[PDB]
Amino acid sequence: SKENRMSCTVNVLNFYKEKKREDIYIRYLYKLRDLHRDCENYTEAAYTLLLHAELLQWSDKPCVPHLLQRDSYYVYTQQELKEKLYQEIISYFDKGKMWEKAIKLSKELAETYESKVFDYEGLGNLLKKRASFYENIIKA
Amino acid sequence: YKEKKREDIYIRYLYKLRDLHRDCENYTEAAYTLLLHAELLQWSDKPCVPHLLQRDSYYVYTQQELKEKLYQEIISYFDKGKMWEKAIKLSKELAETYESKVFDYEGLGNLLKKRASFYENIIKAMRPQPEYFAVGYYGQGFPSFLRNKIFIYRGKEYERREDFSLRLLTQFPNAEKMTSTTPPGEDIKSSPKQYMQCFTVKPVMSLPPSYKDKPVPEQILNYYRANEVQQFRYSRPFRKGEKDPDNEFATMWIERTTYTTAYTFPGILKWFEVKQISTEEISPLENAIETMELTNERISNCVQQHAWDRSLSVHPLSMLLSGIVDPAVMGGFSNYEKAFFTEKYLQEHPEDQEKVELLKRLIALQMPLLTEGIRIHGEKLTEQLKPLHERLSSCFRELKEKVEKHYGVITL
Amino acid sequence: MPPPADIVKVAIEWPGAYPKLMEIDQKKPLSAIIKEVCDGWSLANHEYFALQHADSSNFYITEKNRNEIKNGTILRLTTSPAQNAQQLHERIQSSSMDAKLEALKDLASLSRDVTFAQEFINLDGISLLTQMVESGTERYQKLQKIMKPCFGDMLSFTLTAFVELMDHGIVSWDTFSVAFIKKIASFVNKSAIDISILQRSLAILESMVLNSHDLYQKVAQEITIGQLIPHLQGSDQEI
């Protein structure tokens, strides 16, 4: 089944995590989260997407074509890829009903703003999101 | 009282001050007073003392309740004060105190979303830079603490030295515009009929560590060029001796004057006695060299802040280029050859020589900065800016040969 | 004192973009300096802009009263008064009552100016105001059934703006019509009307009196003693 087939994909993902063909690993991880958003469950979506971006680092310069994806081929400045994935993961938690880790990631996003990008528009929007998170939590 | 550590009447007068500033409708300093009151208090969940309360309102009041109340009106002031960095900082600590101490998440959200609003105001809103005029006091009849002292005032945001003169001198019949800005008066040090002197002085920037190496927009730069400062420069010229009217830049000495004060603007009060003085002056050689160096810094910052915005301010940057070409190609460099690239510029002093090769490497760095500006303008060109671009690029090429073969500037 | 720096510290403002900070020449006409203002934010088309006296005055400062600006105020830049005026009377022709409503509110806000009054003159829209007040009270009768208070506010704003334009005197004074006194009668001979429309009608009455005589005879044929005293029954000392 779709659940069973994604489970077996995870098992072969472990097979990678030894064999570490990290490129095809990440791509089949992508397929995994694709069928997952087909299944409308956000937990491992966010988790694995992070662990992909967790492999990434807050440095700017992109080096490894492994982590360079093949969607919209440009240099893929590492931190900006990270932050992208961060906002969609925040959206996952938005529809994921759980917000603690969302705030945990939000704070990193904000401090990265004030590290390099300085986009006070994004600062503000991320902070309205954090506020939303707090009233969600109290209103659960 | 602070010296005599009588905290109680201390607080009394602090609140007198907040009312006094309110009636003066001054908000930054009122907030500042409110802080230095608050910073007595700590984040202990123990209502240790009621003595610190003003007798207006009290129930059990763990100190944190009072601290957060204080912060509420303080951030209100900093808002209406239209100055923000300290506000967002206070938001940082108020938010952490909420989240890990009282868990009042509605307040968390309220203050943090207001902090975001303040961020956007920082970017979107304009910050006028108040100018700083140095006011010496000389004459017999003053209040004792106003005698033979220099008070530099953060004047109004759009207020020029003459208008400040109006304030001080309509404030003072026996008005005197004693013009010799530099020297005091020994006669007047105990003579009545009080001597004033006033003149703008220029702030020493509040260089924030670790921000020099960043994509800092102009917003941060202005905010710190006009606030939380302590030192203020003031320059005057010297010209005596070798009287060549072509380019006097061997005896165009200038006399900058900076000062150091006990505490830091903006404070609980919008002026201060001077607590230390920087008396200084330099020979025109090093002076003009530093002018060029700071100009290189100017356009370097221009291109870096410009290296990330497409529809950034175009025309004034092009005007900086125009000043680089139209007045500076002939006049701004005629000194470079005559006043510098001549033998007299060494018979001035055999002591140092990195002078002229230093300015040569500076102009060598200068030209690629203009390549950068030229091409980014090539993105910025308007219907009329192509011919201006082409003419300045023609001048740019001829200056290539002027620096490389005429100046002898080393290519690298 | 009479020479300052010809450039003077008034922060300049523009919609959307930042209010810019610089000093502005008092020795350079308000077209080159307008051009530089536009190009400051990297903008163009300076020739269709107007410097508003950005307080509640909303006036459009010319080079005569350019000298009256002092340092450090707000100066918003909306399009040239000719552009605003043509647009405004264009929205006045708009059959949609809402576009006329907004244009008319702008007109009431702006007619206090004398310069804007002059451009309004040179676009000849005063004639349009004339014929529209003198016809629309009898033309829209079907929807007037509902828009009696709507036309109340429209007449009010129209006449406030009209008297603000009219009082300056440079305007001629047969700019009324027989239909002018007709709408006067539709104010003063029917039931109670809006106070402000009545105020401005009476104001035009007295100005017309100031102008000439046979005009006063004209209004005299629509003068009854027992209509003007019901305006004493209006206990407002102003009316």
CSV table of C-alpha atoms in Angstrom, one decimal, chain C residues 11 14 20 23 32 48 57-58 61 91 123 127-128 136 142 148 183 187 204 223 236:
chain,number,residue,atom,x,y,z
C,11,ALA,CA,12.2,66.4,3.9
C,14,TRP,CA,6.3,60.7,-2.4
C,20,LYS,CA,13.6,61.7,1.0
C,23,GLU,CA,17.7,70.7,1.1
C,32,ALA,CA,14.0,71.6,-12.7
C,48,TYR,CA,2.5,66.1,-14.3
C,57,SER,CA,-4.1,73.6,3.6
C,58,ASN,CA,-3.4,71.2,0.7
C,61,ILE,CA,2.8,76.5,-3.6
C,91,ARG,CA,-15.1,61.8,-12.6
C,123,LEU,CA,-10.5,74.0,-17.8
C,127,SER,CA,-19.8,75.8,-16.7
C,128,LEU,CA,-20.2,72.0,-16.1
C,136,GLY,CA,-29.6,67.0,-12.4
C,142,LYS,CA,-36.5,58.4,-10.8
C,148,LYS,CA,-32.5,62.9,-2.3
C,183,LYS,CA,-32.4,75.6,-8.3
C,187,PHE,CA,-34.0,75.1,-2.3
C,204,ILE,CA,-24.1,83.2,-4.1
C,223,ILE,CA,-38.1,86.8,-3.0
C,236,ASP,CA,-28.6,78.7,14.3
